[PDB]
Design an enzyme around this catalytic site. Sequence first.
Site, PDB file in Angstrom:
ATOM      1  N   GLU A  11      80.385 -13.789  67.111  1.00 43.04           N
ATOM      2  CA  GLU A  11      79.756 -14.169  66.386  1.00 43.04           C
ATOM      3  C   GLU A  11      80.402 -15.458  65.477  1.00 43.04           C
ATOM      4  OE1 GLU A  11      76.930 -14.319  65.820  1.00 43.04           O
ATOM      5  OE2 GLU A  11      76.691 -12.981  66.941  1.00 43.04           O
ATOM      6  N   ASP A  20      72.497 -20.602  63.105  1.00 40.43           N
ATOM      7  CA  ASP A  20      73.031 -20.097  64.132  1.00 40.43           C
ATOM      8  C   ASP A  20      72.320 -21.154  65.608  1.00 40.43           C
ATOM      9  OD1 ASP A  20      70.726 -19.399  64.801  1.00 40.43           O
ATOM     10  OD2 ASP A  20      70.792 -16.874  64.717  1.00 40.43           O
ATOM     11  N   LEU A  32      71.608 -12.982  59.969  1.00 35.73           N
ATOM     12  CA  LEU A  32      71.306 -14.339  59.743  1.00 35.73           C
ATOM     13  C   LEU A  32      70.289 -14.225  58.345  1.00 35.73           C
ATOM     14  CD1 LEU A  32      68.932 -15.921  60.981  1.00 35.73           C
ATOM     15  CD2 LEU A  32      67.258 -14.033  61.796  1.00 35.73           C
ATOM     16  N   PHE A 104      72.956  -6.645  68.235  1.00 32.96           N
ATOM     17  CA  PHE A 104      73.125  -6.734  66.893  1.00 32.96           C
ATOM     18  C   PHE A 104      73.293  -8.647  66.437  1.00 32.96           C
ATOM     19  CE2 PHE A 104      76.073  -7.104  63.127  1.00 32.96           C
ATOM     20  CZ  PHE A 104      76.301  -9.023  63.743  1.00 32.96           C
ATOM     21  N   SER A 117      66.157  -3.052  82.893  1.00 33.51           N
ATOM     22  CA  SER A 117      67.603  -3.137  83.060  1.00 33.51           C
ATOM     23  C   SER A 117      68.141  -2.039  82.081  1.00 33.51           C
ATOM     24  CB  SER A 117      68.459  -4.356  81.769  1.00 33.51           C
ATOM     25  OG  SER A 117      68.042  -5.944  82.112  1.00 33.51           O
TER      26      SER A 117
END
Length: 162
Positions: A11, A20, A32, A104, A117
């Site tokens: 990040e 972002d 955010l 996250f 998945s």
Amino acid sequence: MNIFEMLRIDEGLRLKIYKDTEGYYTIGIGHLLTKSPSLNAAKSELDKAIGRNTNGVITKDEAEKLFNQDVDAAVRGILRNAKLKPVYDSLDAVRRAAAINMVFQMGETGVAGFTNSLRMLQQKRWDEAAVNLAKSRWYNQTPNRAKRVITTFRTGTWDAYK
Ligand SMILES: [Cl-]
Ligand SMILES: [Cl-]
């Protein structure tokens, strides 16, 4: 290496409001602020989050504090989620960090939609999960970061981060 150092690498750290990869108002270590186009709505959320009039700028400590809260919240969202929890519990410690990373970044709903998945990870079919995870908007939009996370799921080591 641990979840904190991992996310800090993915990040970065920015002390002034920025946009972002998706174009949203963010600050610090991937915090955010708002999906609204308004820099003012962003500044408002910011002050609310910090508990002071910041004019769009925070200190490193403030950044770290937001970061500490966000990792925690990420873990708790996983633990509260009926679809995520069982998968997470099944994983080893390194892979758990990869799971936290996804949440996250994309939120609990987002991840939660990776049904197939998730099933593969739970069954420990690593190479298969790696291939399935790549067939996603996520991978297509943030390929370098996705690859890192995916390698972590595939190998169970921190090699992508070393
Ligand atoms: Cl907050
Ligand atoms: Cl990327």
